[PDB]
Amino acid sequence: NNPLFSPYKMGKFNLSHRVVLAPMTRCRALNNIPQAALGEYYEQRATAGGFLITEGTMISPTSAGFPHVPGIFTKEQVREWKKIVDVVHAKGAVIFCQLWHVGRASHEVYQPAGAAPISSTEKPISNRWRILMPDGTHGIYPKPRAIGTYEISQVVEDYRRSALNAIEAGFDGIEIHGAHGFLIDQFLKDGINDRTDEYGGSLANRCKFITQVVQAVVSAIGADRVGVRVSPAIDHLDAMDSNPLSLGLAVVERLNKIQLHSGSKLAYLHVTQPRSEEEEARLMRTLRNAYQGTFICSGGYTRELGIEAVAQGDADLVSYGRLFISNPDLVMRIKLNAPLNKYNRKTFYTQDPVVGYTDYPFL
Ligand SMILES: Cc1cc2nc3c(=O)[nH]c(=O)nc-3n(C[C@H](O)[C@H](O)[C@H](O)COP(=O)(O)O)c2cc1C
Ligand SMILES: COCCOC(=O)/C(=N\O)C(C)=O
């Protein structure tokens, strides 16, 4: 028996298998409005009782750092998302909307009035990283504006309102993007967070922002409709921590406490790992062992590694990114151990509604 096809109860959601669509920015949501193409794309990948997580979705006009990423902060965005959610639900899938603020990982071209991006810090991402521009070239990350605690509470309210909007659009839940060097990770990581106020310094202070974001969306829509994604050991966009395991465990501690205080469990904790392998595996297993709830692992998984993760108790669910780009029927291919299609990096972030998006073939 393939352990990826044993059913799993993710809170109130009965999943038929453990293969999850990882959240992936694809830049087809032209001018930040969800498009019919997104409906075709997610419908292609939906399975009865399968769990899907959307591309990162803007919570406010200042939250974007990629072209043509969808928002969920306007009524028009909610209206267009509803159409996509309806077609996904008609295939029997569960779908969560990932709420995403990029913080300092942006550019004047993505900001209203060309304003500076916001962050925990005034320090820019270093020169070894470059941002994809709307014309397909790569540009320099600018200096961000470090926000005060009043503005922090406004961003928290943006997460809260976007979570309510996601439920209005029919989403089963939301995922907080707290990974990969974006805004929340810019508070978590001591390689970024140089604050001297109550949001910087100690582990507890660096965890304050993610705790307040999660608390706000839990209060708005319920813990069982909230998943949280973090990546303590991934240093994307200069997001290094001096002790990734300690940071990860501090986050897990706060999530366990939110659950006790709310009297209910989160939908899940979702952790991406970098790709020795043994040290990374032990870090992941330690986070899983410490967290009181459902654990989704992600990052470089294959059919074999996903089977092993569930069989060994290292994870409850396994999310796949790049192979799901090029294999719309990845779930069926994993079930049959069928050959997988190659994915084309060149069309990860282009705008065509078909080419490199919905034209990868089925079996
Ligand atoms: C094109 C692309 C877009 C991605 N966009 C997001 C995103 O919007 N939010 C997020 O949390 N992770 C994003 N990721 C990371 C994936 O969710 C996932 O963790 C990674 O692809 C898993 O590794 P795998 O591709 O080997 O399966 C993206 C990855 C790719 C390749
Ligand atoms: C492909 O990069 C691996 C980690 O994923 C990211 O950093 C990400 N979003 O989290 C985007 C939009 O790419």
From Swiss-Prot:
Expressed in roots and to a lower extent in leaves and flowers. One of its GO terms (molecular function) is 12-oxophytodienoate reductase activity. CDD domains: OYE_like_FMN (cd02933). It is found in: Peroxisome. Pathway: Lipid metabolism; oxylipin biosynthesis. SUPFAM superfamilies: FMN-linked oxidoreductases (SSF51395). Induction: By wounding, locally and systemically. One of its GO terms (biological process) is oxylipin biosynthetic process. Residues 321-322 are annotated as: FMN. One of its GO terms (cellular component) is peroxisome. The active site is at 182 (proton donor). It catalyses: (1S,2S)-OPC-8 + NADP(+) = (9S,13S,15Z)-12-oxophyto-10,15-dienoate + NADPH + H(+). Keywords: Fatty acid biosynthesis, Fatty acid metabolism, Flavoprotein, FMN, Lipid biosynthesis, Lipid metabolism, NADP, Oxidoreductase, Oxylipin biosynthesis, Peroxisome. Its cofactor is FMN. Its EC number is 1.3.1.42. Its main location: other. The keyword Chaperone does not apply. It comes from the Eukaryota. FMN binds at residues 23-25, 56, 98, 229, 300, 321-322. Gene3D superfamilies: Aldolase class I (3.20.20.70). Substrate binds at residues 177-180, 275. The keyword NADP applies. Specifically cleaves olefinic bonds in cyclic enones. Involved in the biosynthesis of jasmonic acid (JA) and perhaps in biosynthesis or metabolism of other oxylipin signaling moleclules. It is required for the spatial and temporal regulation of JA levels during dehiscence of anthers, promoting the stomium degeneration program. In vitro, reduces 9S,13S-12-oxophytodienoic acid (9S,13S-OPDA) and 9R,13R-OPDA to 9S,13S-OPC-8:0 and 9R,13R-OPC-8:0, respectively. Belongs to the NADH:flavin oxidoreductase/NADH oxidase family. This is 12-oxophytodienoate reductase 3. It comes from Solanum lycopersicum.
